[PDB]
Design an enzyme around this catalytic site. Structure first.
Site, PDB file in Angstrom:
ATOM      1  N   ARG A  51     -27.282 -58.257  47.221  1.00  0.00           N
ATOM      2  CA  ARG A  51     -26.417 -57.654  48.403  1.00  0.00           C
ATOM      3  C   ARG A  51     -26.357 -56.124  48.158  1.00  0.00           C
ATOM      4  O   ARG A  51     -26.495 -55.509  49.096  1.00  0.00           O
ATOM      5  CB  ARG A  51     -25.071 -58.478  48.368  1.00  0.00           C
ATOM      6  CG  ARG A  51     -25.159 -59.571  49.392  1.00  0.00           C
ATOM      7  CD  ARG A  51     -24.206 -60.661  48.966  1.00  0.00           C
ATOM      8  NE  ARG A  51     -22.810 -60.017  49.427  1.00  0.00           N
ATOM      9  CZ  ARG A  51     -22.277 -60.287  50.518  1.00  0.00           C
ATOM     10  NH1 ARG A  51     -23.148 -60.765  51.558  1.00  0.00           N
ATOM     11  NH2 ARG A  51     -21.057 -59.777  51.015  1.00  0.00           N
ATOM     12  N   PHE A  63     -20.531 -52.030  45.012  1.00  0.00           N
ATOM     13  CA  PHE A  63     -21.556 -51.309  45.719  1.00  0.00           C
ATOM     14  C   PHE A  63     -21.680 -49.726  45.373  1.00  0.00           C
ATOM     15  O   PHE A  63     -22.913 -49.482  45.287  1.00  0.00           O
ATOM     16  CB  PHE A  63     -21.406 -51.433  47.106  1.00  0.00           C
ATOM     17  CG  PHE A  63     -22.280 -51.197  48.063  1.00  0.00           C
ATOM     18  CD1 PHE A  63     -22.736 -49.844  48.297  1.00  0.00           C
ATOM     19  CD2 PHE A  63     -23.333 -52.075  48.718  1.00  0.00           C
ATOM     20  CE1 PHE A  63     -23.848 -49.470  49.104  1.00  0.00           C
ATOM     21  CE2 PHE A  63     -24.423 -51.817  49.377  1.00  0.00           C
ATOM     22  CZ  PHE A  63     -24.653 -50.386  49.575  1.00  0.00           C
ATOM     23  N   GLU A  76     -28.180 -47.462  74.861  1.00  0.00           N
ATOM     24  CA  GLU A  76     -27.594 -48.823  74.662  1.00  0.00           C
ATOM     25  C   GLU A  76     -28.070 -49.881  75.962  1.00  0.00           C
ATOM     26  O   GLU A  76     -27.807 -51.048  75.936  1.00  0.00           O
ATOM     27  CB  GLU A  76     -26.308 -49.115  74.096  1.00  0.00           C
ATOM     28  CG  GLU A  76     -25.297 -48.127  75.092  1.00  0.00           C
ATOM     29  CD  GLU A  76     -24.053 -47.753  74.137  1.00  0.00           C
ATOM     30  OE1 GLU A  76     -24.183 -47.014  73.290  1.00  0.00           O
ATOM     31  OE2 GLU A  76     -22.922 -48.498  74.167  1.00  0.00           O
ATOM     32  N   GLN A 128     -20.726 -42.087  68.034  1.00  0.00           N
ATOM     33  CA  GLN A 128     -21.099 -40.889  68.674  1.00  0.00           C
ATOM     34  C   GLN A 128     -19.833 -39.853  68.936  1.00  0.00           C
ATOM     35  O   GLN A 128     -18.499 -40.216  68.909  1.00  0.00           O
ATOM     36  CB  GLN A 128     -21.648 -41.327  70.064  1.00  0.00           C
ATOM     37  CG  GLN A 128     -20.576 -41.890  71.086  1.00  0.00           C
ATOM     38  CD  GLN A 128     -21.070 -42.465  72.510  1.00  0.00           C
ATOM     39  OE1 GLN A 128     -21.339 -43.398  72.676  1.00  0.00           O
ATOM     40  NE2 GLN A 128     -21.429 -41.273  73.348  1.00  0.00           N
ATOM     41  N   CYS A 131     -19.948 -37.757  85.667  1.00  0.00           N
ATOM     42  CA  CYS A 131     -20.765 -38.860  85.250  1.00  0.00           C
ATOM     43  C   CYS A 131     -20.163 -40.056  85.483  1.00  0.00           C
ATOM     44  O   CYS A 131     -20.622 -41.045  86.176  1.00  0.00           O
ATOM     45  CB  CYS A 131     -21.387 -38.459  84.010  1.00  0.00           C
ATOM     46  SG  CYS A 131     -21.617 -36.901  83.574  1.00  0.00           S
ATOM     47  N   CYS A 171     -22.769 -37.977  91.297  1.00  0.00           N
ATOM     48  CA  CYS A 171     -23.456 -36.818  90.732  1.00  0.00           C
ATOM     49  C   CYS A 171     -24.311 -35.953  92.123  1.00  0.00           C
ATOM     50  O   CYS A 171     -25.241 -36.701  92.570  1.00  0.00           O
ATOM     51  CB  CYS A 171     -24.548 -37.017  89.604  1.00  0.00           C
ATOM     52  SG  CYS A 171     -25.289 -35.549  88.699  1.00  0.00           S
TER      53      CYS A 171
HETATM   54  C1  FMN Z   1     -24.587 -38.479  79.708  1.00  0.00           C
HETATM   55  C2  FMN Z   1     -24.559 -38.571  78.137  1.00  0.00           C
HETATM   56  C3  FMN Z   1     -24.665 -39.991  77.976  1.00  0.00           C
HETATM   57  C4  FMN Z   1     -24.769 -40.352  76.433  1.00  0.00           C
HETATM   58  N1  FMN Z   1     -24.846 -41.539  76.023  1.00  0.00           N
HETATM   59  C5  FMN Z   1     -24.933 -41.645  74.507  1.00  0.00           C
HETATM   60  C6  FMN Z   1     -24.869 -43.045  74.280  1.00  0.00           C
HETATM   61  O1  FMN Z   1     -25.063 -44.039  75.075  1.00  0.00           O
HETATM   62  N2  FMN Z   1     -25.169 -43.355  72.969  1.00  0.00           N
HETATM   63  C7  FMN Z   1     -24.948 -42.276  71.967  1.00  0.00           C
HETATM   64  O2  FMN Z   1     -24.777 -42.621  70.782  1.00  0.00           O
HETATM   65  N3  FMN Z   1     -24.994 -41.199  72.269  1.00  0.00           N
HETATM   66  C8  FMN Z   1     -24.891 -40.744  73.835  1.00  0.00           C
HETATM   67  N4  FMN Z   1     -24.696 -39.392  74.084  1.00  0.00           N
HETATM   68  C9  FMN Z   1     -24.443 -38.367  73.305  1.00  0.00           C
HETATM   69  C10 FMN Z   1     -26.002 -37.775  72.909  1.00  0.00           C
HETATM   70  O3  FMN Z   1     -26.884 -38.736  73.005  1.00  0.00           O
HETATM   71  C11 FMN Z   1     -26.067 -37.097  71.555  1.00  0.00           C
HETATM   72  O4  FMN Z   1     -26.004 -37.938  70.415  1.00  0.00           O
HETATM   73  C12 FMN Z   1     -25.311 -36.019  71.371  1.00  0.00           C
HETATM   74  O5  FMN Z   1     -23.963 -36.400  71.433  1.00  0.00           O
HETATM   75  C13 FMN Z   1     -25.599 -34.937  72.470  1.00  0.00           C
HETATM   76  O6  FMN Z   1     -24.872 -33.581  72.156  1.00  0.00           O
HETATM   77  P1  FMN Z   1     -24.828 -32.239  73.249  1.00  0.00           P
HETATM   78  O7  FMN Z   1     -24.217 -33.007  74.443  1.00  0.00           O
HETATM   79  O8  FMN Z   1     -24.109 -31.245  72.556  1.00  0.00           O
HETATM   80  O9  FMN Z   1     -26.290 -31.786  73.265  1.00  0.00           O
HETATM   81  C14 FMN Z   1     -24.918 -39.210  75.552  1.00  0.00           C
HETATM   82  C15 FMN Z   1     -24.422 -37.874  75.980  1.00  0.00           C
HETATM   83  C16 FMN Z   1     -24.385 -37.581  77.422  1.00  0.00           C
HETATM   84  C17 FMN Z   1     -24.451 -36.176  77.870  1.00  0.00           C
HETATM   85  S1  F3S Z   2     -21.493 -33.005  84.574  1.00  0.00           S
HETATM   86 FE1  F3S Z   2     -22.373 -35.160  84.973  1.00  0.00          FE
HETATM   87  S2  F3S Z   2     -22.090 -35.675  87.111  1.00  0.00           S
HETATM   88 FE2  F3S Z   2     -24.004 -34.567  87.333  1.00  0.00          FE
HETATM   89  S3  F3S Z   2     -23.928 -32.457  87.570  1.00  0.00           S
HETATM   90 FE3  F3S Z   2     -23.737 -32.730  85.333  1.00  0.00          FE
HETATM   91  S4  F3S Z   2     -24.678 -34.950  85.168  1.00  0.00           S
END
Ligand code: FMN
Ligand code: F3S
Lengths: 410, 1483
Positions: free
Chosen positions: B31, B209, B876, B924, B1098, B1103
């Site tokens: 493990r 671990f 996801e 995240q 969003c 949007c």
């Molecule tokens: C609209 C939107 C949806 C996101 N959805 C996910 C997500 O489902 N899973 C995840 O791990 N990160 C998600 N993120 C984060 C980005 O994938 C990334 O990990 C990071 O946070 C982007 O940083 P930044 O906006 O400064 O470029 C999302 C970001 C945005 C703007």
């Molecule tokens: S902040 Fe979100 S609602 Fe549309 S204008 Fe940018 S993707």
């Protein structure tokens, strides 16, 4: 602003219905002994503050005045007089050997401290010591007062009179001469009134649906008493909402999870608001919560056969009129909430005797007293096509008027 | 890694028990992870009874008296001898002073040559000392107490003198042999174990671990009394409360020894060591081991209706004197004559045990631990949550948990004490006073209120009953970097549970949480009676004005209150000291409530920051041993947010009263708006705030406000370490920062401007979650947005240069902006550096779910990344299989990176294999410790089909990965993913925070190819605003810590480092590379290029540019093109090339890790608070490798599938022909089928192979993740038992588990399957012959199963499929059930309904003939494949079985299915019928 005028009006109406002359109203409209005093108190900072205290005694023909003391900044002579008259009405309704009294102090206990409160209580007792005593005037607690303040007043009076005087003041702790049942008194009285009303209306308490608006100490004790009697509580309310279950609410579990303030609602669960809680289908409704809840709009929507005003003035004139039209039995607060006064009277009796009773004795005596008062009021309101509120007012004023006439004051 | 114990019930002592224990350790070794070298012992240990016979044989000189009248020590000493004899002499002197006799000393033989180099170097000298009891000590408990006192005195003397010696064990019944040794190395090192004279009735064993590669011999366990598997997340609070209570402790058993044993807990010890110290201290104090364990880790009594009255009273009583030690824990304690095992409240660790007919018990995390005879096995059970497994050797029997709990609860009248001694605070009803000030605007300005704050946090809270959502996480600068004055709250960031402990779902597991709070003074913990519960209790820490007034006016002498005005003029230290003196004076006078008030403040007197005041007072009272005698109430105007309340509670506040927020609500009500009344508004605000605080606790996994209060789950950013130590001890501040004088200056400035403010009667607009002219700076300002869009649309360079200049300079937005290049180097030409084509390969588009985005934006980003050669990430929400085939024009919509989240929505064998990188989203930036919720109205058919769910039915993504409860589970998941796609890179995505470097080292040990660090500035489609703003830390600190720790531990070359979070410029890319990031993520900027204007809507599905919405009308307005993304990436690469040329760097690997090129700029020094930061922590270059070289050799070779299954199955798979084979399997074979399933999916795909084509029989016990990601055509049989994670991510096929033919006991009564099964499963069927554990079919999405009983939290987040349970069901069943149907057979329908969650399900009966026939066919198949007596009996009594069956189905699921069926009957096609039903149900 018009509390004293309203009290005068109800006194006048009751006396007119009873047939007494106008001199009785002239005597009973205002107290015959009002004392205003200035209390110097040394504060923690070292400064001195002058507080204003009032003490009103409506009548003493029946016996020593009985009243309460409240520590509020909005107290006034008019309020003190009106509440003294109301206390006289309560004592007459319960058939106690008491008069009406009321004390008040212009202060803010929230900003005051423990030692400052002790000093203020002692100073008030000293200022009014000349007209109060176990045989003249018996205070009790009210808003922002409790057993500690009562004990301070009792110590002050004993320290003045050179001997212990437990009967001078009620609401004391058990060790200082307090009485059992001081906490469940109001709830037990409400329970007795509910049972008597159900018996009169033919409703069987077994399986009767009860809704309680308010789950404080009074609400919790009332719910427990109904559950023990066998009635099913289908609704309770707290500061955050209410619950509804026609088949029962598990009062045991609710009390077990009850906190100090009485909250029983869950966090992520939607609750029932009071407006639609009052409209639930039930046989018994008990508002023991904030006032002005029943009005014209909800009077027709109320589905309760019996309504008991556990709190103070939870119903308006229009609501009472509509309920009378709809044939809903209303139990006034002036009668329902007399358990505390009755238990204070029992405490006074115990202090006089030197013998202190038990919970069972207090229960049975309160039951007999409240049952007799309720039956008298109901018979009066049946003989005369009037409301229970007016009947209770008449019963309250009758004893005082007769005592004054016998003693020759009018 | 894990724990185990092999014991005999009757107490018979042998050496075979010890041998078997070492065998279990050897088996469990698989493990654990792999460090720098395999030969080094990661850490192991073995606890046994006192070997009297062996000691007598091997001493030959010491006169050993009878058993219980002498004790044995065990000491680890330094190699130096002078101090060794010094400590020996001191120990002998202490023993003589205590009166016990020194029998003698012995030296334990050690085989150093059998140990690894590091453990060889760190090997101590092992010497034991023998103590003989004086005649006065009649009982053995007194002798044990004397030994405990001696050990504590010796340890105190050692720490005072600075000597380094450890007391591994000192007892008259237990002996511990432990160290940095592997299971095979333990016996070799300790030659004593080989001797046959070693006899013990039981043998406990533990293997560690060691997240870090620098463990110590002392830190290894078994500890003195117990073995602990897991982690403790309330350690700081537990330590603080214990050290406060120790001063007030008074015991007759110890007498004056309490002064000697005052420290109790070791400050430098680990969580397990501290827990063991507390356990042993409480045991000697006069508490039984079971009672102590129950008090330390109580069951959840609040919100749990499945608990008896006596148990509820017991736990409620003990909650008033001991806070829970929360976290995932499996505890096994022993006192020689008694052994006990328990789990945490939520049961997040595995524990299975066997009981044999020969009175032998084998308990361990795994089940296939030793070879056993089925005819000899009697019971195969598991450690259920809330149940204690207790054995008494003297009594020779297992004591039932029911009996133990009943006895302990009934030993005292806890219920009567609670009923009587409770104090009520029933307030007066006519004392109502709606408070208003008439200086409301002035107070609002002083405390920082804004029109945005009100209209977007207070009104929405009332309207919705929850914290408002948001999007596009914080782009504004930190408080320490912002020119504008900021509240002290903004300097503290919420922490979260990433690895070593999972988060929890408070809403779904409300039965586990508790907001109960105690106000007053604690009673005598050691000898409690009545007075301990003579206190106030609240259901919610948030206090309304009436409750606050009632508490102030209680007056009760036993319950006294004192008010302290936390105000200052010039000297903040002076103000704090006066507050301390007032508190001490009140405590001496007898006060039990301290009310810190900001009221009565004016221009001359400004309020102390309530967080600072509360923390300072809490620390002072803890130091002086008075905190437990009082409670802290706060009355501050700077308390209007969930973050504020959580910070105050976590740093010490017991209750809070937001009087200013209530006044604001009252004003809004009075002026016409907010028609809802004042009382309901106040109640709703309190409830919503409490719920938000509960969510904040759930982020870290703490389920109880009692524990969260002591625990400090916040990390400061920009606070001097001196101030932290003075007032926030235990808090982390990497860069230090501002001082108390600066804090006071900020507060005074805000107060002064607010109180003067002699121009306007209005509140200034906010700029926290929106951009306003003249407000706080935002990185994505309109200027930057439009410049970037214009540059990308032109394909122009000077516009991009202007945008980069605006983003980088003219303001201080991030920490990296404080750094400047040296500028004294040898610049080269742009032609001597690597090309932008090679540079861009290190870039990525970032994870963004298909549902969150639109189809057009997702496909455009994927096309751009594929064209540029980089990698795109699918979120996801799954992926469309049609995107795996490039279009005729050459555009490829496939996502190179596939994300694995807690939802596991689109996870499938095909989905995994059709990828190059598999990421695991541990957290995240915007919502690290939280999950998600997609309402049915947002679940459109084109999303439901992709995610394998029903349209119009809500979807819930749990916060934690139910597989990942620890680092070992993370390693197991990585192994499963590698089995699924051996030709893919495994990535782990974490969020920057303190300790993230150690977590990254643990991940590298767990064999993760790539580690991604995300800043708190990262974006999201929907998240709470408080989580967006006050959770996480900048990626700079985390990246630096991870780089340094990996280089120190020698693991940097094994892993690739990536970073993301507000990477907008080539300068940012260069700074990340210098900090040590090889890969970079970009999410928000590509969206802005596509057309996003940072509307932050969003989450509203509105949007205007058709980027973050599924509405066709808005999607028609989408104008983005992949060419713009390509141009943006190329411009970034050109910027990096120019910067490299300026810095004289030829290659990315050459520039990576070179922090010497950076120096603090003059702007930072000019800044009045950024100049106090210590950036040397980031500016540090340890010697080592700074680039990934080693490919992280996995254990794919030597696997069962490769060795046996594949060589005999490849031809069958290629030919499409049937093939049946049989193997013998042990616990070391973990996955056993995923590789074959992946091969099938690659060859064919979703269609897989014909049913029952490949058949794999297994005999014995299987390992974790058995039958994972098995597609259609494969049928696995298992004669025996299996461990957790059975059927994980099933994509079809069949899994059958039948009890061993030699086991004649009732299968329905015996356990056969591990806790988590069919998590994230999509399709297939299964048949289990026995009971399962907790969280069965957590995220099933179409798999039909038949199981003979399950544990708690069954069918938690199911969205499809069916479940048939032929047995009992645990509590909280169907918690989160949004889809699927569960059929349960039971006799007590009322009990079943009480156990089930009633939120979102219905109870019905089997009336449909089709459903009845389907269930009958399922049972027939089950009995055919299992020979199940229960199934046979039910089939025989089918008429009664149908009547007694119970059906569970979600309301929305039933309604949607009924509507679809009605439309189909009406004669509408599938797509149109689904669309019409969705519109009708989500109008
Ligand atoms: C609209 C939107 C949806 C996101 N959805 C996910 C997500 O489902 N899973 C995840 O791990 N990160 C998600 N993120 C984060 C980005 O994938 C990334 O990990 C990071 O946070 C982007 O940083 P930044 O906006 O400064 O470029 C999302 C970001 C945005 C703007
Ligand atoms: S902040 Fe979100 S609602 Fe549309 S204008 Fe940018 S993707």
């Amino acid at each position: 602003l018009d509390v004293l005028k309203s009290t005068q009006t109800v006194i006048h109406k009751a006396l007119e219905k009873l047939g007494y002359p106008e001199e009785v109203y002239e005597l009973l409209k205002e107290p015959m002994r009002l004392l205003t005093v200035k209390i110097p108190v040394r504060m923690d900072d070292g400064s001195v503050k002058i507080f204003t205290g009032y003490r009103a005694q409506h009548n003493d023909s029946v016996g020593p005045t009985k009243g309460g003391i409240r520590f509020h900044p909005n107290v006034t002579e008019k309020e003190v007089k009106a509440l003294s008259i109301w206390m006289s009405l309560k004592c007459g309704i319960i058939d106690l050997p008491y008069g009406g009294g009321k004390g008040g102090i212009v202060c803010d206990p929230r900003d005051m401290s423990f030692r400052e409160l002790e000093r203020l209580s002692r100073g008030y007792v000293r200022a009014i010591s000349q007209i109060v005593g176990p045989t003249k005037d018996v205070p009790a607690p009210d808003v922002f007062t409790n057993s500690q303040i009562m004990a301070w007043m009792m110590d002050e009076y004993s320290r003045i009179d050179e001997f212990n005087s437990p009967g001078f003041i009620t609401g004391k702790p058990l060790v200082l001469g307090g009485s059992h049942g001081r906490e469940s008194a109001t709830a037990k009285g409400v329970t007795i009134c509910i049972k008597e009303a159900a018996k009169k209306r033919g409703i069987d308490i077994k399986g009767a649906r009860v809704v309680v608006q308010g789950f404080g100490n009074a609400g919790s004790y009332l719910a427990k008493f109904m559950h023990d009697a066998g009635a099913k509580v289908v609704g309770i309310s707290d500061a955050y909402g209410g619950l509804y279950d026609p088949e029962g609410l598990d009062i045991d579990y609710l009390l077990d999870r009850r906190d100090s303030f009485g909250t029983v609602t869950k966090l992520f669960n939607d609750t029932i608001t009071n407006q639609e809680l009052l409209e639930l289908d039930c046989d018994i409704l008990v508002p023991a919560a904030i006032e002005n809840q029943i009005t014209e709009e909800n009077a027709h929507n109320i589905r309760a056969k019996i309504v008991v005003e556990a709190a103070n003035g939870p119903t308006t004139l229009e609501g009472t009129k509509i309920l009378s039209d709809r044939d809903i039995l209303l139990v006034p607060d002036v009668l329902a909430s007399a358990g505390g006064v009755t238990v204070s009277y029992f405490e006074w009796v115990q202090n006089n005797q030197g013998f202190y009773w038990s919970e069972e004795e207090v229960e049975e005596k309160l039951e007999k007293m409240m049952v007799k008062s309720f039956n008298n009021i109901y018979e009066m309101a049946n003989n005369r096509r009037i409301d229970m509120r007016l009947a209770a007012y008449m019963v309250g004023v009758r004893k005082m008027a007769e005592a004054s006439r016998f003693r020759g004051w009018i | 890694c894990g724990i185990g114990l092999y014991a005999h019930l009757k107490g018979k002592q042998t050496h075979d028990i010890v041998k078997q224990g070492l065998k279990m350790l050897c088996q469990l070794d698989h493990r654990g992870g792999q460090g720098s070298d395999p030969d080094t012992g990661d850490g192991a240990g073995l606890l046994v009874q006192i070997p009297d016979a062996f000691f007598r044989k091997e001493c030959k000189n010491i006169n050993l008296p009878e058993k219980e009248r002498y004790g044995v020590g065990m000491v680890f000493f330094s190699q130096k001898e002078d101090e060794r004899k010094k400590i020996e002499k001191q120990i002998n002197a202490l023993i003589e002073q205590e009166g016990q006799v020194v029998l003698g000393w012995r030296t334990v033989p050690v085989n150093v040559g059998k140990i690894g180099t590091v453990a060889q170097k760190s090997c101590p000298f092992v010497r034991q000392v023998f103590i003989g009891a004086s005649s006065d000590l009649k009982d053995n408990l007194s002798f044990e107490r004397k030994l405990y006192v001696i050990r504590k005195q010796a340890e105190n003397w050692g720490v005072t003198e600075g000597l380094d010696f450890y007391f591994a064990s000192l007892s008259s019944q237990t002996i511990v042999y432990k160290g940095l040794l592997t299971p095979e190395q333990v016996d070799a090192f300790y030659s004593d174990l080989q001797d046959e004279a070693f006899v013990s009735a039981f043998a406990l064993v533990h293997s560690r671990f060691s997240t870090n590669t620098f463990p110590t011999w002392e830190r290894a366990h078994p500890n003195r009394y117990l073995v602990h598997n897991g982690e403790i997340n309330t350690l700081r609070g537990n330590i603080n409360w214990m050290r406060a209570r120790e001063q007030q402790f008074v015991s007759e058993s110890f007498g004056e020894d309490l002064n000697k044993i005052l420290p109790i807990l070791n400050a430098d010890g680990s969580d397990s060591s501290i827990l063991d110290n507390a356990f042993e201290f409480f045991v000697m104090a006069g508490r039984k081991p079971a009672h102590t364990a129950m008090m330390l880790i109580p069951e959840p009594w609040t919100e749990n209706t499945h608990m008896s009255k006596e148990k509820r009273a017991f736990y409620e009583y003990h909650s008033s004197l001991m806070e829970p030690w929360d976290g995932p824990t499996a505890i096994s304690f022993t006192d020689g004559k008694q052994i006990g095992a328990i789990l945490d409240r939520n049961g997040l660790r595995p524990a299975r045990y066997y009981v044999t007919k020969d009175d032998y018990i084998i308990f361990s995390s795994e089940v296939g631990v030793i070879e056993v005879e089925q005819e000899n096995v009697l019971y195969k059970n598991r450690l259920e949550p809330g149940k204690m497994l207790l054995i008494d050797l003297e009594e020779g029997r297992i004591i039932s948990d029911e009996e133990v709990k009943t006895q302990i609860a009934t030993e005292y009248p806890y219920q009567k004490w609670l009923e009587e001694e409770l104090v009520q605070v029933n307030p007066d009803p006519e004392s109502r006073e709606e408070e208003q000030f008439s200086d409301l605007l002035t107070r609002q300005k002083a405390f920082g209120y804004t029109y945005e704050d009100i209209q977007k946090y207070l009104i929405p809270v009332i309207k919705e009953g929850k914290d408002p959502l948001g999007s596009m996480g914080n782009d504004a600068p930190l408080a320490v970097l912002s020119d504008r004055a900021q509240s002290l709250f903004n300097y503290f960031k919420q922490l979260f549970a990433q690895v070593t402990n999972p988060p929890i779902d408070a809403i779904r597991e409300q039965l586990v949480t508790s907001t109960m709070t105690w106000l007053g003074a604690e009673g005598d913990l050691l000898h409690p009676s009545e007075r301990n519960v003579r206190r106030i209790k609240l259901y919610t820490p948030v206090l309304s004005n009436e409750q606050f007034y009632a508490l102030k006016t209680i007056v009760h002498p036993d319950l006294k209150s004192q008010k302290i005005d936390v105000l200052f003029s010039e000297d903040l230290e002076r103000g704090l000291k006066d507050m301390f003196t007032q508190a001490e004076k009140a405590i001496s006078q007898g006060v039990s409530l301290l009310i810190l008030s900001d009221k009565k403040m004016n221009e001359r007197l400004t309020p102390i920051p309530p967080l600072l005041a509360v923390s300072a007072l809490h620390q002072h009272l803890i130091r002086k041993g008075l905190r437990t005698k009082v409670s802290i109430i706060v009355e501050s105007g700077e308390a209007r947010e969930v973050h504020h309340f959580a910070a105050l509670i976590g740093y010490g506040a017991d209750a809070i009263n937001p009087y200013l927020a209530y006044a604001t609500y009252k004003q809004e009500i009075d002026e016409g708006r907010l028609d809802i009344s004042y009382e309901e508004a106040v109640s709703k605000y309190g409830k919503s705030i409490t719920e938000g605080v509960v969510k904040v606790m759930s982020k870290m996994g703490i389920s109880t406000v009692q524990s969260y209060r002591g625990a400090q789950i916040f990390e400061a950013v920009g606070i001097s370490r001196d101030v932290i130590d003075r007032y926030f001890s235990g808090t982390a501040s990497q860069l230090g920062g501002i001082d108390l004088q600066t804090i006071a200056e900020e507060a005074q400035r805000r107060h002064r401007e607010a109180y003067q403010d002699d121009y306007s009667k209005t509140l200034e607009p906010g700029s926290d979650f929106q951009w306003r002219n003249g407000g706080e700076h935002h990185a994505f300002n309109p200027k930057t947005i439009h410049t970037l869009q214009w540059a990308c649309r032109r394909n122009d360079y000077n516009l991009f240069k202007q945008y980069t200049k605006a983003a980088d300079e003219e303001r201080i937005g991030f920490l990296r902006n404080l750094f400047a290049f040296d500028g004294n180097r040898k610049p080269l030409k742009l032609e001597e550096v690597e090309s932008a084509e090679s540079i861009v390969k290190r870039f990525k588009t970032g994870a963004m779910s298909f549902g969150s985005l639109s189809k057009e934006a997702h496909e455009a980003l994927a096309i751009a990344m594929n064209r540029l050669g980089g990698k795109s990430n699918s979120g996801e929400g799954g992926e469309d299989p049609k995107r795996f085939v490039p279009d005729e024009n050459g555009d490829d919509r496939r996502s190179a990176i596939k994300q694995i989240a807690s939802g596991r929505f689109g996870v499938k064998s095909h989905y995994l294999v059709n990828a190059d990188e598999l990421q695991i989203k541990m957290a995240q930036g915007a919502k690290p410790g939280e999950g998600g919720q997609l309402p049915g109205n947002k679940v459109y058919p084109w999303v439901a089909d992709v995610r394998g769910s029903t349209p119009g039915v809500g979807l819930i993504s749990p916060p934690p990965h139910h597989d990942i409860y620890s680092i070992e589970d993370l390693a197991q998941l990585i192994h499963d993913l590698k089995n699924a796609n051996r030709d893919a890179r495994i990535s782990v995505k974490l969020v920057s925070k303190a300790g993230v470097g150690t977590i990254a080292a643990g991940v590298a040990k767990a064999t993760a190819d790539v580690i991604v660090i995300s800043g708190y500035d990262g974006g999201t489609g929907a998240s709470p605003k408080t989580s967006i703003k006050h959770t996480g830390l900048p990626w700079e600190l985390g990246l630096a810590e991870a780089h340094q720790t990996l280089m120190l531990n020698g693991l940097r070359d094994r892993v690739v480092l990536e970073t993301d979070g507000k990477l907008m410029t080539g300068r940012d890319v260069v700074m990340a590379a210098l900090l040590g990031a090889e890969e970079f993520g970009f999410a928000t900027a590509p969206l802005v290029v596509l057309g996003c204007v940072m509307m932050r809507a969003c989450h509203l599905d509105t949007c205007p540019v058709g980027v973050a919405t599924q509405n066709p009308e808005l999607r028609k307005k989408f104008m983005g093109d992949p060419d713009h993304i390509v141009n943006y990436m190329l411009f970034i690469a050109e910027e990096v090339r120019e910067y490299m040329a300026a810095l004289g760097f030829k290659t990315f690997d050459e520039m990576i890790g070179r922090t010497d090129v950076l120096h603090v700029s003059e702007r930072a020094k000019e800044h009045w608070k950024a100049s106090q930061l210590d950036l040397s922590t980031l500016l540090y270059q340890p010697e080592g490798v700074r680039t990934f070289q080693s490919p992280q050799n996995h254990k794919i070779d030597q696997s069962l599938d490769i060795t046996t299954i594949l060589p005999a199955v490849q031809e069958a798979i290629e030919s499409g022909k049937e093939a049946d084979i049989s193997i013998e399997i042990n616990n070391t074979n973990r996955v056993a089928g995923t590789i074959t399933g992946s091969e099938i999916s690659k060859r064919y795909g979703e269609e897989g192979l014909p049913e029952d084509t490949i058949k794999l029989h297994f005999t014995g016990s299987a390992g974790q993740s058995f039958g994972a990601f098995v597609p259609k055509g494969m049928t696995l049989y298992l004669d025996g038992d299996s461990n957790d994670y059975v059927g994980k991510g099933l994509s079809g096929g069949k899994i059958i588990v039948k009890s061993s033919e030699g086991f004649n006991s009732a299968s329905d009564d015996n356990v056969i399957i591990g806790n988590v099964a069919f998590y994230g499963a999509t399709s297939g069927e299964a048949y289990i012959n026995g009971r399962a554990g907790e969280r069965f079919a957590v995220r099933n999405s179409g798999v039909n199963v038949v199981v003979e009983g399950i544990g708690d939290h069954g069918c938690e987040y199911m969205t499809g499929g069916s479940v048939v349970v032929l047995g009992d069901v645990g509590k909280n069943f169907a918690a989160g059930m949004s889809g699927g149907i569960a059929y349960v057979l039971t006799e007590d329908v009322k009990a079943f309904k009480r156990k089930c969650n009633l939120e979102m399900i219905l109870f019905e009966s089997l009336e449909d003939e089709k459903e009845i026939q389907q269930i009958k066919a399922m049972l027939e198949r089950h009995t055919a494949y299992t020979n199940s007596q229960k199934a046979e009996d039910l089939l025989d009594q089918w008429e009664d079985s149908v009547k007694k069956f119970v059906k569970v189905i979600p309301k929305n699921y039933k309604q949607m299915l009924a509507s679809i069926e009605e439309q189909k009957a009406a004669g509408l096609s599938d797509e149109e019928a689904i669309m019409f039903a969705f519109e009708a149900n989500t109008k």
